[PDB]
Amino acid sequence: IHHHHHHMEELLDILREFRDSRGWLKYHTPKNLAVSISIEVAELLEIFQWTRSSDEEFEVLERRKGEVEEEIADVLIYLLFLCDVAEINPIEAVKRKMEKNERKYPK
Amino acid sequence: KIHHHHHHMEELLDILREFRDSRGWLKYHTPKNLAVSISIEVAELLEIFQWTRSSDEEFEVLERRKGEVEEEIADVLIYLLFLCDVAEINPIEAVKRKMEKNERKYPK
Amino acid sequence: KIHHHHHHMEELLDILREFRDSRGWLKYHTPKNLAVSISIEVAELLEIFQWTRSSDEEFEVLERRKGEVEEEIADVLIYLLFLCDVAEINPIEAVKRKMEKNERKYPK
Amino acid sequence: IHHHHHHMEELLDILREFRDSRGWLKYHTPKNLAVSISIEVAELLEIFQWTRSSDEEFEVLERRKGEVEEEIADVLIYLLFLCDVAEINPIEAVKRKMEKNERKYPK
Numbered sequence: 001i002h003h004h005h006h007h008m009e010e011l012l013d014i015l016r017e018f019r020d021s022r023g024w025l026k027y028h029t030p031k032n033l034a035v036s037i038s039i040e041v042a043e044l045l046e047i048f049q050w051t052r053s054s055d056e057e058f059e060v061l062e063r064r065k066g067e068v069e070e071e072i073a074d075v076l077i078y079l080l081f082l083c084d085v086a087e088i089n090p091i092e093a094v095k096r097k098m099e100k101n102e103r104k105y106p107k
Numbered sequence: 108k109i110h111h112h113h114h115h116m117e118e119l120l121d122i123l124r125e126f127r128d129s130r131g132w133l134k135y136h137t138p139k140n141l142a143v144s145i146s147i148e149v150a151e152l153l154e155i156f157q158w159t160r161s162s163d164e165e166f167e168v169l170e171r172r173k174g175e176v177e178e179e180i181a182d183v184l185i186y187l188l189f190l191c192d193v194a195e196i197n198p199i200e201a202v203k204r205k206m207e208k209n210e211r212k213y214p215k
Numbered sequence: 216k217i218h219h220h221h222h223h224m225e226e227l228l229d230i231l232r233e234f235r236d237s238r239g240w241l242k243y244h245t246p247k248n249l250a251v252s253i254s255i256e257v258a259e260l261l262e263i264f265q266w267t268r269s270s271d272e273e274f275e276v277l278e279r280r281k282g283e284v285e286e287e288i289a290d291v292l293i294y295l296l297f298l299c300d301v302a303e304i305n306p307i308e309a310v311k312r313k314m315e316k317n318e319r320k321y322p323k
Numbered sequence: 324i325h326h327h328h329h330h331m332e333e334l335l336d337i338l339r340e341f342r343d344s345r346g347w348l349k350y351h352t353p354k355n356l357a358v359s360i361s362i363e364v365a366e367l368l369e370i371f372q373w374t375r376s377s378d379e380e381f382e383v384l385e386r387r388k389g390e391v392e393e394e395i396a397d398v399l400i401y402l403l404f405l406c407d408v409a410e411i412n413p414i415e416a417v418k419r420k421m422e423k424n425e426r427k428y429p430k
C-alpha cells in the first residue's frame with residue numbers, strides 16, 4: 001500500500017473550499033494575489049523590523065515564533081491561490097528553478 | 108499489507124538543503140535575510156504585471172509570460188522553505204492552523 | 216536688494232532629525248533597517264487597494280480612503296528621508312540625475 | 324527678495340513633462356503606482372540582501388552608493404507620480420504624521 005503525500009495539493013483543496021463557499025474567486029486576479037503576497041511578506045518582515053544583529057534575529061524568532069508561523073502561512077496561502085489561477089505546479093516550479101540554479105552556481 | 112508512505116515535501120526540502128550546504132550558504136540564512144529575500148522575489152513577481160490596467164489584461168500577460176511567473180513563484184517558495192528550515196516551522200501545519208482561524212473570523 | 220532663501224526641505228528634515236534624536240532612535244537607523252521600514256510602509260499603502268478590480272474602482276477607493284493613503288505616503292517618505300540622512304544622499308539631486316538617465320533610455 | 328524652494332513641487336514639473344511627452348499618464352492608476360513603489364523599494368533592499376551586520380551594511384552603502392542613490396530616486400519618482408494622481412501634498416502629509424507621532428511617542 002503506497003501513500004503519495006502531496007501536501008500542497010491537499011492544502012489547495014482546503015483553500016478552494018474556503019474561497020468558493022464565500023464567492024471570493026472573483027477577487028483572485030493574478031495581480032491582486034501577487035499584491036496579497038507582497039502584503040503578507042511585509043507582515044513577516046515587520047516582526048524583525050528593528051533588529052541589529054543575526055543574534056537578535058534568532059531571539060525575536062524564538063519569542064515571536066507564533067507570529068512568524070502565521071505570516072509564513074499567509075504568504076503560502078496566497079502563493080497557492082495564485083498557483084490555482086495561473087495553473088502552475090509550485091513543486092515542479094521549485095524543482096526546475098533549483099536545476100537551473102545548479103548549473104548557474106556549480107560546485 | 109505493508110504501508111509505504113512517500114514524503115515528497117521532505118524530498119523537495121532535501122534538494123534545497125543539499126544546494127545550500129554544498130555551497131556553504133547556511134551562514135547567510137538568518138531569519139531577516141530570508142524574509143528580505145522573499146520580499147525581493149515577490150517584487151520580481153509583481154513586476155511582470157506592473158502596468159496592467161484590467162483583470163482581462165492580467166490574464167493575457169499571465170498567459171504570455173507564464174514562464175517568468177513560474178520562476179518567481181519558485182523563487183518565493185524556495186526562500187520561504189529555507190526560512191521554514193531555519194525556524195523549524197512546518198508550513199503545511201501553519202496553513203492548516205491559519206485556515207482554521209480564518210474559518211472562525213469569516214464564518215459561513 | 217538682499218536675497219533670502221528658504222530651505223523648506225531642510226526644515227522638514229530638521230523636524231525628522233529632532234524626533235529621532237530626542238528618542239535616541241538613531242542607533243536603530245541602519246541602512247538595511249530603514250530599507251526594511253520603507254518596504255513595510257509601501258505594503259501598508261498597497262493594502263488600501265488590495266482587492267480592487269478596475270482602475271475605475273481604485274479612484275473610488277482612493278477618494279473614500281484618502282486619509283489612509285495620505286498616512287502611508289507620509290510613512291514611506293519619512294523612512295526614505297531618514298535613509299537619505301544616514302547615507303548622506305540628496306534625494307532631489309538623485310531624482311534629477313535619474314530623470315536625466317530616463318531621458319536617454321526613453322527618448323522623445 | 325524671497326526665494327521659497329519647494330523642491331518636490333519642482334521635481335514634479337520635471338516628472339509631469341516626462342510622463343506627458345510620452346503619454347504614460349494613462350498607466351498611472353493608484354494601484355499601478357503603489358505597485359511601482361513596491362518594486363523599487365525591493366530594488367533598494369536587494370543591494371543589502373545578504374549582509375550579516377550593521378557594520379557590513381555601512382560598508383555595502385559606501386561601495387554601492389550609486390546603486391542606493393538610484394533606487395532612492397526610483398522610490399521617490401513613483402511616490403511623487405502617486406501624489407500627483409491622488410492630489411496629495413507629500414510634505415504636508417509628513418508634517419501631519421510627525422505631529423501624530425509626537426503625541427503617540429511623547430518625551
Ligand SMILES: [Cl-]
Pocket residue numbers: 005007113114115116117118
Ligand atoms: Cl512530506
Ligand SMILES: [Cl-]
Pocket residue numbers: 221222223224225226328330
Ligand atoms: Cl531645501
Ligand SMILES: [Mg+2]
Pocket residue numbers: 040043070071074
Ligand atoms: Mg498576515
Ligand SMILES: [Mg+2]
Pocket residue numbers: 148151178179182
Ligand atoms: Mg527571482
Ligand SMILES: [Mg+2]
Pocket residue numbers: 256259286287290
Ligand atoms: Mg504606516
Ligand SMILES: [Mg+2]
Pocket residue numbers: 363366393394397
Ligand atoms: Mg530601480
Ligand code: NA
Pocket residue numbers: none
Ligand atoms: Na545559528
Ligand code: NA
Pocket residue numbers: none
Ligand atoms: Na554608524
